[PDB]
Curated annotation (Swiss-Prot), chains A, B, C, D, E, F:
Disruption phenotype: Little effect on miRNAs levels. Plants lacking both RICE1 and RICE2 have reduced miRNAs levels and lower miRNA retained by AGO1, thus leading to the up-regulation of targeted mRNA transcripts. Homohexamer with DnaQ-like exonuclease fold in a ring-shaped structure with a central cavity. Component of AGO1 and AGO10-centered RNA-induced silencing complexes (RISC). Interacts with and acts as a cofactor of AGO1 and AGO10. GO terms for cellular component: cytoplasm; plant-type vacuole. This is Protein RISC-INTERACTING CLEARING 3'-5' EXORIBONUCLEASE 2. Belongs to the RICE family. The gene is RICE2. Keywords: Cytoplasm, Hydrolase, Nuclease, RNA-mediated gene silencing. Its EC number is 3.1.13.1. InterPro entries: 3-5_Exonuclease_domain, RNaseH-like_sf, RNaseH_sf.
Amino acid sequence: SASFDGPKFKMTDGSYVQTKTIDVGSSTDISPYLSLIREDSILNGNRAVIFDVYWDVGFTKTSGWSLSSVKLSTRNLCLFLRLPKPFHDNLKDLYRFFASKFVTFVGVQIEEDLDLLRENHGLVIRNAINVGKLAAEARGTLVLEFLGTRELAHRVLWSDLGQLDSIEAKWEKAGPEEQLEAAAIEGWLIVNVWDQLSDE
Amino acid sequence: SASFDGPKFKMTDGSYVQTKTIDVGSSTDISPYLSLIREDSILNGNRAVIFDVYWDVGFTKTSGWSLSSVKLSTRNLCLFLRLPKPFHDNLKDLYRFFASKFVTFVGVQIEEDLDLLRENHGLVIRNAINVGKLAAEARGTLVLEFLGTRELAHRVLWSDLGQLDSIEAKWEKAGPEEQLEAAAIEGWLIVNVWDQLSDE
Amino acid sequence: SASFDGPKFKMTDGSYVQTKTIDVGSSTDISPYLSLIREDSILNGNRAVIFDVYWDVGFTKTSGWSLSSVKLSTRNLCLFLRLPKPFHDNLKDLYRFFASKFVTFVGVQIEEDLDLLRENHGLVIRNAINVGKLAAEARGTLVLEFLGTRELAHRVLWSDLGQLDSIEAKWEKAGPEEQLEAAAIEGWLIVNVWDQLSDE
Amino acid sequence: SASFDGPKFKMTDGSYVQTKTIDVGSSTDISPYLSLIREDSILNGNRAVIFDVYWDVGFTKTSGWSLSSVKLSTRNLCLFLRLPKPFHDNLKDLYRFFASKFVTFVGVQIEEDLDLLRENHGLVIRNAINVGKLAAEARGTLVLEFLGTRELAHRVLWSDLGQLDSIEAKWEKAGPEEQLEAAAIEGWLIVNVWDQLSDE
Amino acid sequence: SASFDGPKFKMTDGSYVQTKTIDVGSSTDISPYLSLIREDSILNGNRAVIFDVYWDVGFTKTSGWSLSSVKLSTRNLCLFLRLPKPFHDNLKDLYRFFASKFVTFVGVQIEEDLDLLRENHGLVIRNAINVGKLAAEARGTLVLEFLGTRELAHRVLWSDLGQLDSIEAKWEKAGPEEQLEAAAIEGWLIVNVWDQLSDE
Amino acid sequence: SASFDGPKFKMTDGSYVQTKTIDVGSSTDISPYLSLIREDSILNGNRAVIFDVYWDVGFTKTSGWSLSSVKLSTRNLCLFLRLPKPFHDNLKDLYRFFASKFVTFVGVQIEEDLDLLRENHGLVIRNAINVGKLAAEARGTLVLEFLGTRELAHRVLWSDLGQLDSIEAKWEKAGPEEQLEAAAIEGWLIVNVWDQLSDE
């Protein structure tokens, strides 16, 4: 079965979120996993796919960083790829995926990650939006442009952030489980941020 | 006589799009169809040609991308071109066409493709229009420059995208003619978005 | 001596455009015909000059793009310089005049062109205007920067464009003579587009 | 367990800034201190982390700038990290901190630092803000974009800075502990700045 | 003693301009003339000298172009310097004059000029301004930005340009002395253009 | 000991400025001199230092320029620095100076001056401002952004500049002490410009 069989997490408005963490290896087909997300975004999430990237530090002086992970969030799905260093050819599906015009790619503070993706991986997100700028602008409030995730979720939702803060506040001690929950939470939270700004 | 003898599709308006697919070689002459694209553009299309490009992704980093397909749509026609790698001289017709000032090349989210196209192929579209932004400014809706081909149509024309969302939701399993049909409805959706935008 | 003794065309408002075409080799003198345009442009056109360019696309990929000819139009004249490859020193006069302050160089869809001219042939134009943008602003119509040629002047001079549309509609079946008419007419139109713009 | 046993500096409002200065060697684990910064910022500072970097100038013409120290501040704590010459792997923690998204990074006059951090160490603060600008825009007082750490605190807050001015005025002669107080004073000060602008 | 011992020209406002021409070889001392320009721009020229440049085009492709001529003039004076290829140490003072902050350097279309001068001669103009460029905004007429030297004067001052128009209307049919006339008149007009935008 | 014992000059309002001129070789210690400027700046000079630079032009095309003169001005002191070529270790004291955010480095027409400092010497000014632009936004006059040092001061302070003007007008006949006089004057003027705008 190609389904999302990792832990479900309970949000704040009653809904839940699944899981699918893969230790992406050289011949790990991640396409069927990329399908759902797409299917879910198109049928259930208004065609937005929320994301985030994680970099292994490195040593142009930033040509050493490695794209160690990626988060993709829609209505009902979140996939966590723990990409390999270095990339193998099975990753074309990853590149092909990010170049699609079916969905807008939503992320917070991505200007830098995008140049990195370009210079260090040749990955192009043809349809991306750094969402803090549109947030601040749609609202005429400059400060939203310079907010991190948790805090950008607050100046747009106010939903209860206590649980997310308890995990983030103690991130050094948080096991892969609470760490995954924080990623699903803000992965869902930014979905709510975008629905609000564009459904407006 | 030079003709679009491929499958025909019906839009949410009884209209019928005439298609053609050329697997261009190193001795093929595609000029009779681009000329048919230009004619329908001038005579009955307010000199707009809508387009999209499709790359063979690759691993200077964005050096792996290579134009594998080009779609050119006019109100009446949709010309889908599957291209080889590398190009041969016979494709000079495509460069010459895209550099034309007779019509405006209407694309959706082509900012990265216009550049990868310029840098990777030398295919200058002197008169291209990333159509997105115009929408946001004209309609006074910030999110328009930030949507995929469909959602922009939905947000600008609010027509029926039923057949469209269905085929796209299950993309990796859609037959060839289903993928063409999706290209058709999008080509027709944007040729309408444009016609609706240049006159308001 | 020198005079525009080629085909003289009659415009829709009854005016005429004289013409001249030279098959520039590597020894000819093109000054004499450059004077006449600068004469008509200063005495009859008030430093108005409308041009267009044409490239040989060769297989940095745009490095091969070489200039094949240029169109220079004023009030009552249309000059055509068909260029060799490579260029010879007798062509220094086209460079000093295209980059002249004694006059300006109104172009339609020229940003890329300036790039190719400067970067590919050391061709600099110091006083240039990509007229769609000024047209768009001058008259509160965003879509004018994005129109190509016949539609900018349409949206702006609303003049008789049947004959023009009739020819370009079948560009491929047009004799080098009729293609002249189509170019002289769009040149005249654009000079008219600009005479209006500088006054608004 | 971790604590900050360096001196505290009861500010001017009666509060006490707890400080700590660490000499980072090739095996020093600073994760416990950064952990507490993020912890305090999140549970006590609204996820803002103000900062500043210290440069060793050496003899690209700017290739001789050497990041010798970095100051991180929340309302309760100010952490000083003084980097070793060979950056080993135990510094990837610092890098991962400047890259996180859990908090933001607000500095005074940081345009050349980040640019410089990016060129000499491969360090790109994913989410940071050059606050003088936000203050100028937020308040409509352009000049705020051009003030050093103090006139900015002065012109925005108008608080007592006698202790600070008297220390910086005789800077060449200031010893260790005194230097600590100046930056320390400036750390807490900028912490208040962002707090007063983030929601005004 | 060095003086402006060339012809004088009556301007249409009844005033006069004194001029000096010099072909620079290698042992030429131009400093006296520069001093006369500065003194007069300071004493009564309100510290804004009008300056224009001329090029020796030559087969980065534009790196063979040499700053062929340099015109430096204000109200009362005009200096024309024809340069050799390559420069000798005696042109350093031209580089220095062009660097002074005692005055503002004004010229028509300098955008490509400043680039070229920087790139092929290391000659930097530290305190420069595009006159027609400031002319446009200062008047709510976006097209003033794109005017050749004659028209800008025409459209901001609207005087009698018959004499100049007469000469720039038969360029090749004019001797060396006649070229200086237009140059010197080239100046006066911009001088008055600046003064109009002076206290507007 | 270290003090400003050069000529003292009387300004427009009867105040004075003390000078110091240092012929910096490889052994010169501007130490108590960078140190004294910092102080005068802090206690009595409104958190910034007015400053101007001057270049030695020698023959990348702009790499012949060598910073030969650094003028550092404050409330009461005009410190002067003539540099050697190339720099010795004794120039670390200088690089560190302009790296301080204790004061704002206010310059007039510094665009290229900040650019040459970077590519020529790798010298970085973190807290710099090209002040003419600020005056333009504040004082409501477009031109001030394009004014020289004296004209900007004239235009913002309507101060008597007869003294400065007479010296600048005949600059070639001015000796060392007369040029310092003018340099100290322009410094005082910009200092007065800075006090004025900071309050607006």
